[PDB]
Design a protein around this ligand. Structure first.
Ligand SMILES: *[C@@H]1O[C@H](CO)[C@@H](O[C@@H]2O[C@H](CO)[C@@H](O[C@@H]3O[C@H](CO[C@H]4O[C@H](CO[C@H]5O[C@H](CO)[C@@H](O)[C@H](O)[C@@H]5O[C@H]5O[C@H](CO)[C@@H](O)[C@H](O)[C@@H]5O)[C@@H](O)[C@H](O[C@H]5O[C@H](CO)[C@@H](O)[C@H](O)[C@@H]5O[C@H]5O[C@H](CO)[C@@H](O)[C@H](O)[C@@H]5O)[C@@H]4O)[C@@H](O)[C@H](O[C@H]4O[C@H](CO)[C@@H](O)[C@H](O)[C@@H]4O[C@H]4O[C@H](CO)[C@@H](O)[C@H](O)[C@@H]4O[C@H]4O[C@H](CO)[C@@H](O)[C@H](O)[C@@H]4O)[C@@H]3O)[C@H](O)[C@H]2NC(C)=O)[C@H](O)[C@H]1NC(C)=O
Ligand SMILES: *[C@@H]1O[C@H](CO)[C@@H](O[C@@H]2O[C@H](CO)[C@@H](O[C@@H]3O[C@H](CO[C@H]4O[C@H](CO[C@H]5O[C@H](CO)[C@@H](O)[C@H](O)[C@@H]5O[C@H]5O[C@H](CO)[C@@H](O)[C@H](O)[C@@H]5O)[C@@H](O)[C@H](O)[C@@H]4O)[C@@H](O)[C@H](O[C@H]4O[C@H](CO)[C@@H](O)[C@H](O)[C@@H]4O[C@H]4O[C@H](CO)[C@@H](O)[C@H](O)[C@@H]4O[C@H]4O[C@H](CO)[C@@H](O)[C@H](O)[C@@H]4O)[C@@H]3O)[C@H](O)[C@H]2NC(C)=O)[C@H](O)[C@H]1NC(C)=O
Ligand SMILES: *[C@@H]1O[C@H](CO[C@H]2O[C@H](CO)[C@@H](O)[C@H](O)[C@@H]2O)[C@@H](O[C@@H]2O[C@H](CO)[C@@H](O)[C@H](O)[C@H]2NC(C)=O)[C@H](O)[C@H]1NC(C)=O
Ligand SMILES: CC(C)[C@H](C)[C@@H](O)[C@H](O)[C@@H](C)[C@H]1CC[C@@H]2[C@@H]3CC(=O)[C@H]4C[C@H](O)CC[C@]4(C)[C@H]3CC[C@]12C
Ligand SMILES: CC(C)[C@H](C)[C@@H](O)[C@H](O)[C@@H](C)[C@H]1CC[C@@H]2[C@@H]3CC(=O)[C@H]4C[C@H](O)CC[C@]4(C)[C@H]3CC[C@]12C
Ligand SMILES: *[C@@H]1O[C@H](CO)[C@@H](O[C@@H]2O[C@H](CO)[C@@H](O)[C@H](O)[C@H]2NC(C)=O)[C@H](O)[C@H]1NC(C)=O
Ligand SMILES: *[C@@H]1O[C@H](CO)[C@@H](O[C@@H]2O[C@H](CO)[C@@H](O)[C@H](O)[C@H]2NC(C)=O)[C@H](O)[C@H]1NC(C)=O
Ligand SMILES: *[C@@H]1O[C@H](CO)[C@@H](O[C@@H]2O[C@H](CO)[C@@H](O)[C@H](O)[C@H]2NC(C)=O)[C@H](O)[C@H]1NC(C)=O
Ligand SMILES: *[C@@H]1O[C@H](CO)[C@@H](O[C@@H]2O[C@H](CO)[C@@H](O)[C@H](O)[C@H]2NC(C)=O)[C@H](O)[C@H]1NC(C)=O
Ligand SMILES: *[C@@H]1O[C@H](CO)[C@@H](O[C@@H]2O[C@H](CO)[C@@H](O)[C@H](O)[C@H]2NC(C)=O)[C@H](O)[C@H]1NC(C)=O
Ligand SMILES: *[C@@H]1O[C@H](CO)[C@@H](O[C@@H]2O[C@H](CO)[C@@H](O)[C@H](O)[C@H]2NC(C)=O)[C@H](O)[C@H]1NC(C)=O
Ligand SMILES: *[C@@H]1O[C@H](CO)[C@@H](O[C@@H]2O[C@H](CO)[C@@H](O)[C@H](O)[C@H]2NC(C)=O)[C@H](O)[C@H]1NC(C)=O
Ligand SMILES: *[C@@H]1O[C@H](CO)[C@@H](O[C@@H]2O[C@H](CO)[C@@H](O)[C@H](O)[C@H]2NC(C)=O)[C@H](O)[C@H]1NC(C)=O
Ligand SMILES: *[C@@H]1O[C@H](CO)[C@@H](O)[C@H](O)[C@H]1NC(C)=O
Ligand SMILES: *[C@@H]1O[C@H](CO)[C@@H](O)[C@H](O)[C@H]1NC(C)=O
Ligand SMILES: *[C@@H]1O[C@H](CO)[C@@H](O)[C@H](O)[C@H]1NC(C)=O
Lengths: 720, 715
């Protein structure tokens, strides 16, 4: 009886239904939520997708439904708990993706039974172990199989693919941990295969399997992020794939030149990713016949020459072009403007000389160019004013060049501008007062390590979308505009190493998402505003997440960097940055910006050092639970160290040196288990150094020049 | 009687014998040689300077003649008198003036034992027709190069040669036709073939060419072959090929990677002068025997110098000028330890001069560093002083600065110091050519050099060409210049030189080009400048690339050394813009006389020279430019100027010259640019030549000139 089976599913499996999705399941079964029936009154499809259901799934309880042909359980928190009751199965579509299944015997069962299965999606689970079983030889209908993003591991069986039914069209094995020699894997007849991906595994080999050439109908072949080695197959090999639209051999270990015979795909090829290998030479001239190519990604290779002009410019339909991290010298080719559909151009980290490309914007058509990225090159001159004509621009990155001169107002007035990134040049001038009023409401304004002068506009408050402001190591003066507190998406504010005066505006406490505040090495006076901690426990993560960054940790003392946006820049260029190459010891962390809290966070990085701030430390500062760096050194702070600082559980760096702090070191600091860099020297501190935690573990230099501190590592208090 | 034939040859054929090559004229006769029998077997009259009319029959009548050597003379073609058989095995009629190709048809029909024949460097005209007779089974060498053959070649021409042929040279003619039409036949024993420097067209090789399995040299240069270089398996047919030249054709596309199939044996490759793009394929790392690689005048780019060429262990000569190679000169190029000649001129190179070749674990063999018309910066590195084998350094048209290290001036074998169009500073050391090499060219014009020209220049007795114009030189011209008897060109314009024009310049036996304009010189015009007139001998300054910019304005433009520089780079130099109207002639230096010449170019304008014009100046018969303008010259214009037969430019303006214009100026047929304005000249304008058609500005500012184009003298 169907009513009974479904009741048995809700009680054994469902452990929590916080949305009451299954409140309708009471007593015909056909009116129940997610349940659909034939006219006979028999269940033929259960759909409980994205239902907030937590439970332990044993498919055998649901498969007992003799007429169940569709089962949708994707987007819940179903764990695994199979019993292998061989209840029999007539499923034709099954989607269990995005759960917490771990026992891969469910796949064995579904492939053994379920001889009418047409599409199965097991992706985005935690299915572990080896792949062993393929759909039963009696299954003659299966077309799509998605096993991607699980924990499959070890070697793929030599005949795993070939054993699949002839009707197979889609097979996705990406995002696992399977290994093996790719040349040993058989695709069998490969009659219907159109989509195949082994991306993001650990698959090796210097040869493709002969069998792969049998897949005459292949349309997307994705073998990226493995360890394939040798040279890319050439000769007549790519003639076997007359329908291929998307190919990726990216992020393997390929070397040599790009075979000219790869152009045999150019009748159909729409997407090509050969990035992240060790390819040398150029894109061969034969690729001029790639009339349908829309996305060409060749970044992170050793390519060189003039192929951007002699080849790429002759590709009419190209929209996305990435050649960063290569060895391409000369000046940016002008013919690149013959590409009238180019939206994204990434030429960062090459050896380009000359001036910035201006031609794209002054073509017979309104320019479609949205992203221009030419960081870490040798471009010189000034930011061309013609860029104003690229009304579609959303992102400009000219960082780490030798650009000079003012920033034309035609940049600040680009309507769609969002990211203005140009740090590590020699740009002069100031920030116009019409920012984000006549130009785009920016998300990022990153102009650190330039020669900018004047005051930060009070119209910076109009940039409500702002996520990241960096103006460090410029020559800005004036006061921090109190209007910064109107920026509620703002997460990172770096103004260190300028000559800013006035107070630290208390309005910075209204910056709801501020997690990184750096005002070091300015001329700020007044008191530490208590409002800087007012968002503690309320901060939400935001869109600053997911950006390339580097962090240079200086290791030369309190007298001897920091966070930088690092899209398209080689780490070598940072080591050789005159500022970085100075301090003897340097460790470069790098990655993508990521939050450590999903909600209810606090500030993460607070550096107010080398100013003239006076007064006492607001007790509220000690409640920033996610704060990792707190540098208040080299100021004129007075009073005591708040006992509330014992609540800085995440703190790693705590610098209070070179102030006029008095009293005792709070014993609750002994409970800071991650504190690895403390400095309280050059104060008026006295009394016992707390015994617990890491406080006894620091070099003597970090307690020096106080008014009678005692206890290890200093001489004992009982002897004085 | 053989003696009777040789005598009938001397008197009937020979018309001049200034060396008395035939004095004793039989086996005792010069060139005549016989067997023990006494039968003529070989007549050798090479390099004899004989003038005559040759009819090979008068010599083939010699029944036993097996060798004939008449190369290096001046024989013309003669009527086909008589008809005898031919027993020749070696025939050499090269470097003569033969015009009738019947001599080839006869040799190909009658000389059936002929092994090697050379008709090269003659004037043989008409179409190629006959191939060596099929009865000839021994002809191994046939050289018909450097003649005047024309029209299409017979399809069967090459294939109709017998099968023992090993060397055929058809180069240096004017033959046309699609290359695919030519049949090579079985091509069993052919090892060297050249069709170079003709007008062959087509986009396919003839299929029969693949039959030449034993080919060691294939030279197809300087034609109109079009398309892409054959790839695939084609070059596998030539497992012995040592030298290949497809240069100066119309090939386009990339260099086939499959051309690397020759790398087991290939020693010489010349693909220059086409429209090739990309780079040398990586597959070429297998070319362990490649000695000479020439890819100049293409459109190549990339780091293949580093990824490929640096891995070629046996290179000695590397030419990549006139390409699109950007970035710094790769340091890995020093891995090429046998590199003798390096030419990277006219690319897009940045960074510093490549000097690493001299710090190898062995003394470098580098003889020629040529990297002109690039964007190099910094200073001439001192590390170049360690390349003790350097003979030629060409760093012109870069952005170099600073002083020229003393280690350069002491390079013992140095001969050509060519670094013009930089911002180099300092001076010429007083120790030039004493501890360093005795130079042939010192070309440093358009720099910022200071000081004086050291008297030590007199030690550079090999000097052919000195250029220091547009510098900041001061002091006097050293009288020691007169010791340079091979000096042909001396350019010192646009400096601040003071003093006299040294009369010792008249001892420069070979001086033909002297430019001292726009200096601060005083004194008199030394008459000795014309003392070599009628005696000048041509010399080794011949055969050098040059450009001449004609301005239509001071010495702006003028003559420059132009090895490895693009004309565009001259058009955009302010050495063009100074005068608004400009035009660029270019070529190779060449004398218009073989002996008994005079000076060719003499510009002394914009100085303060006083006195009268030496009458002797009018006897310079090959002088094409005489500019004495803007000085303080007095006296009259010598009537001897009617002897300046070759003059094109005569500028005598802005002086204080008095008197009449010589009527003999009207006899100067090539005088197209005259200026006599701003003097005290008077009287009629000579009625001859082009003098009545010059603009009024060329006679203005004078004291009573009359006659067309001025108002008539009688009114
Ligand atoms: C193939 O075949 C062919 C034929 O066809 C060939 O070719 C050849 O080659 C050769 C080589 O060797 C050469 O010869 C040489 O040369 C040089 C120069 O060169 C340059 O030039 C030239 C000329 O040009 C002209 O012409 C033409 C035509 O004809 C044209 O095109 C051009 O444009 C020009 O024209 C111009 O001019 C003229 C005159 O004036 C006029 O007319 C007109 O109008 C105009 O203006 C040329 O040709 C050349 O070319 C080359 O190079 C190029 C670049 O590189 C290329 O592209 C090409 O292709 C060619 O190549 C070749 O070479 C190269 C190298 O360079 C190589 O790599 C390759 O492979 C090839 O080979 C040029 O551009 C001259 O210099 C020389 O002379 C020398 O030698 C002689 C003998 O023979 C003598 O007599 C003289 O004197 C000299 O000597 C020297 O050296 C020696 C040793 O070696 C010694 O002993 C002496 O002493 C001397 O020394 C020096 O140094 C020293 C120190 O050590 C001192 O002390 C002294 O003083 C001196 O300085 C020769 O002649 C020819 O030319 C050719 N031809 C043709 C046609 O091309 C080939 O080879 C074949 N191939 C194969 C592979 O086999
Ligand atoms: C072959 O098959 C493979 C899979 O096997 C497939 O590859 C996938 O391609 C995806 C793109 O098509 C890609 O997903 C996007 O990735 C973007 C960033 O990509 C870079 O970084 C990732 C991550 O790099 C990590 O991890 C990799 C591997 O794990 C590692 O190799 C790296 O070194 C690096 O590791 C480091 O960081 C890790 C993470 O912290 C850390 O764990 C490590 O320790 C280490 O430190 C790489 O994969 C890439 O190579 C790149 O380098 C990302 O930006 C993007 O997000 C956007 O899209 C998502 C959904 O599409 C949205 O959720 C998200 O919000 C973003 O949305 C933006 O764009 C959409 C439009 O698409 C727009 O609607 C949004 O509004 C937003 O717009 C933005 O711009 C507009 C202005 O235009 C603004 O207004 C907005 O505010 C926004 O700024 C994607 O998530 C995926 O990573 C990649 N997977 C792998 C494994 O490579 C490949 O495509 C197949 N190939 C073919 C040819 O078919
Ligand atoms: C901003 O602050 C800078 C930095 O000076 C800091 O140290 C000096 C001690 O020399 C101290 O007087 C000042 O309050 C800061 O803490 C000032 O520049 C400094 O000016 C002093 C004047 O006595 C000079 O001695 C210093 O050499 C000089 N620079 C440095 C690096 O020490 C600057 O004048 C201050 N004001 C403004 C508007 O920028
Ligand atoms: C903007 C935000 C999202 C950033 C980019 C976030 O992703 C990063 O993870 C930020 C939070 C961290 C990157 C590493 C950097 C340093 C690296 C280092 O030297 C450590 C020394 C010692 O051990 C104490 C802890 C230190 C200071 C940590 C503190 C956290 C960091 C700033
Ligand atoms: C060093 C020597 C061997 C040189 C390089 C030799 O080769 C060249 O041929 C020299 C002699 C001649 C090249 C052309 C040049 C110019 C070209 C020109 O514009 C002419 C204008 C007028 O119509 C008549 C005279 C002019 C000035 C002639 C005079 C002869 C030249 C200098
Ligand atoms: C199997 O289901 C998964 C999960 O629903 C699909 O992956 C999702 O694809 C959509 C396409 O719009 C993305 O928006 C989601 O982010 C993906 N889920 C992730 C990344 O967890 C997958 O496409 C399905 N299989 C097939 C073959 O389509
Ligand atoms: C600002 O300009 C200076 C001067 O151009 C840059 O520093 C010089 O960079 C060149 C080229 O790399 C080096 O040759 C010099 O040695 C550098 N130092 C000097 C001239 O003192 C500097 O990098 C530029 N700054 C930024 C951030 O790009
Ligand atoms: C965690 O944060 C949430 C919001 O992100 C807090 O819940 C509410 O927050 C709003 C302000 O956004 C307050 O007005 C409400 O009173 C809060 N609701 C409550 C407490 O039920 C929540 O307080 C935070 N929890 C902490 C800091 O422990
Ligand atoms: C080749 O020898 C023949 C035969 O002696 C020469 O022909 C005679 O030349 C003389 C002198 O010009 C004439 O008078 C005769 O009429 C020619 N014919 C005879 C003798 O039959 C011929 O001149 C010789 N060739 C050369 C180049 O000297
Ligand atoms: C080479 O021989 C030819 C004749 O074969 C000579 O040419 C003639 O030379 C005279 C001067 O002696 C001129 O008057 C004639 O006009 C020339 N004739 C032709 C047809 O050019 C030439 O002089 C000889 N050259 C030498 C011996 O160097
Ligand atoms: C001497 O140096 C100057 C300055 O570098 C050169 O002239 C400059 O060249 C640069 C690079 O092409 C141009 O951007 C400048 O506009 C030029 N003119 C200046 C700075 O006034 C000059 O060419 C050098 N000398 C020679 C002979 O080439
Ligand atoms: C052509 O030049 C030659 C060689 O210079 C001159 O003839 C000889 O000149 C030398 C001196 O170099 C004298 O010793 C000889 O006596 C001269 N021989 C003669 C004149 O036969 C010759 O005078 C010059 N011819 C001219 C200028 O017409
Ligand atoms: C002589 O040399 C000068 C100096 O180079 C050339 O022209 C000058 O070029 C410099 C470039 O630094 C300028 O400062 C001067 O204004 C230029 N013009 C003049 C008239 O001095 C000059 O062209 C050279 N002479 C000729 C005839 O070309
Ligand atoms: C698709 O699958 C069917 C059934 O297995 C097979 O016969 C056919 O050849 C395959 N290909 C196409 C293009 O239909
Ligand atoms: C020419 O080639 C043929 C065939 O290889 C051979 O018999 C003959 O000896 C060759 N002749 C010479 C002179 O090498
Ligand atoms: C130059 O020679 C050294 C020594 O053999 C070698 O290791 C290096 O890779 C060579 N460089 C190149 C670019 O081949």
């Amino acid at each position: 009886n169907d009513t009974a089976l479904l009741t048995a599913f809700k009680q054994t499996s469902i452990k929590s239904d916080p949305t009451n999705f299954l409140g309708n399941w009471r007593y015909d079964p056909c009116t129940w939520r997610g349940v659909s029936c034939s006219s006979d009154g028999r269940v033929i499809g259960l759909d409980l997708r994205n239902g907030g259901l937590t439970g332990t799934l044993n498919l055998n309880n649901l498969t007992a439904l003799s007429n169940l042909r569709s089962l949708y359980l994707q987007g819940n928190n179903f764990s695994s708990g199979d019993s292998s009751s061989s209840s029999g199965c007539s499923l034709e579509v099954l989607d269990l993706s995005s759960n917490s299944l771990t026992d891969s015997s469910i796949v064995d069962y579904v492939f053994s039974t379920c001889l009418n299965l047409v599409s199965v999606n097991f992706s985005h689970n935690k299915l572990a172990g080896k792949l062993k079983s393929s759909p039963s030889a009696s299954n003659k209908r299966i077309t799509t199989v998605d096993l991607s993003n699980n924990r499959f591991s070890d070697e793929i069986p030599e005949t795993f693919i070939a054993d699949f039914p002839n009707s197979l069209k889609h097979l996705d094995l990406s995002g696992n941990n399977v290994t093996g020699d790719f040349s040993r894997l058989s695709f069998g007849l490969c009659e219907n295969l159109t989509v195949f991906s082994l991306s993001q595994n650990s698959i090796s080999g210097d040869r493709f399997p002969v069998s792969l050439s049998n897949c005459k109908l292949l349309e997307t072949l994705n073998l990226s992020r493995n360890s394939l080695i040798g040279k890319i197959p050439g000769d007549d090999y790519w003639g076997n794939f007359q329908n291929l639209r998307q190919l990726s051999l990216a992020h393997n270990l390929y070397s040599g030149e790009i075979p000219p015979e790869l152009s045999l795909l150019c009748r159909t090829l729409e997407v090509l990713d050969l990035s992240g290998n060790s390819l040398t030479g150029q894109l061969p001239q034969s690729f001029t016949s790639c009339g349908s190519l829309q996305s060409l990604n060749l970044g992170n290779n050793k390519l060189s020459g003039d192929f951007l002009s002699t080849v790429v410019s002759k590709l009419s339909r190209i929209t996305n072009l990435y050649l960063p991290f290569n060895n391409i010298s000369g000046s940016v080719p002008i013919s690149l403007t013959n590409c009238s559909n180019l939206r994204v151009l990434d030429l960062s980290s090459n050896e380009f000389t000359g001036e910035v490309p201006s031609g794209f914007c002054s073509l017979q058509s309104s320019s479609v160019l949205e992203k221009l990225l030419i960081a870490n090159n040798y471009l010189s001159g000034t930011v061309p004013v013609e860029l104003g004509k690229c009304k579609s621009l959303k992102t400009i990155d000219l960082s780490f060049n030798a650009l000079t001169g003012l920033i034309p107002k035609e940049i600040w007035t680009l309507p769609k501008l969002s990211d203005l990134v140009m740090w590590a040049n020699n740009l002069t001038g100031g920030i116009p007062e019409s920012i984000c009023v006549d130009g785009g409401n920016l998300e990022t304004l990153i102009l650190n390590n330039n020669l900018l002068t004047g005051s930060l506009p009070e119209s910076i408050s109009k940039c409500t979308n702002m996520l990241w402001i960096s103006l460090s190591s410029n020559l800005l003066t004036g006061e921090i505009p109190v209007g910064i507190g109107k920026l509620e998406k703002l997460a990172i504010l770096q103004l260190g190493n300028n000559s800013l005066t006035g107070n630290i505006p208390s309005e910075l406490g209204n910056c709801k998402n501020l997690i990184w505040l750096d005002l070091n090495s300015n001329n700020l006076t007044g008191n530490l505003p208590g409002e800087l901690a007012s968002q503690a426990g309320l901060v939400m993560p935001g869109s600053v997440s997911g950006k390339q960054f580097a962090f240079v940790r200086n290791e030369g003392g309190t007298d001897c960097g920091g966070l930088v946006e690092f899209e398209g820049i080689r780490a070598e260029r940072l080591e050789h940055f005159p500022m970085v190459h100075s301090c003897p010891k340097t460790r470069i962390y790098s990655g993508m910006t990521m939050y450590m809290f999903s909600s209810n966070g606090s500030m993460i990085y607070l550096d107010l050092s080398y100013n003239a701030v006076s007064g006492s430390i607001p007790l509220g500062y000690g409640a920033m639970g996610y704060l990792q760096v707190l540098n208040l050194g080299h100021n004129l702070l007075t009073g005591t160290i708040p006992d509330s600082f014992g609540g800085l559980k995440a703190i790693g760096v705590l610098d209070l040196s070179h102030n006029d702090l008095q009293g005792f070191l709070p014993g609750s600091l002994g409970g800071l288990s991650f504190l690895s860099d403390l400095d309280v020297s050059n104060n008026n501190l006295t009394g016992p150094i707390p015994f617990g935690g890491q406080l006894t573990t620091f070099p003597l230099t970090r307690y020096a020049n106080n008014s009678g501190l005692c206890g290890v590592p200093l001489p004992p208090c009982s002897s004085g």
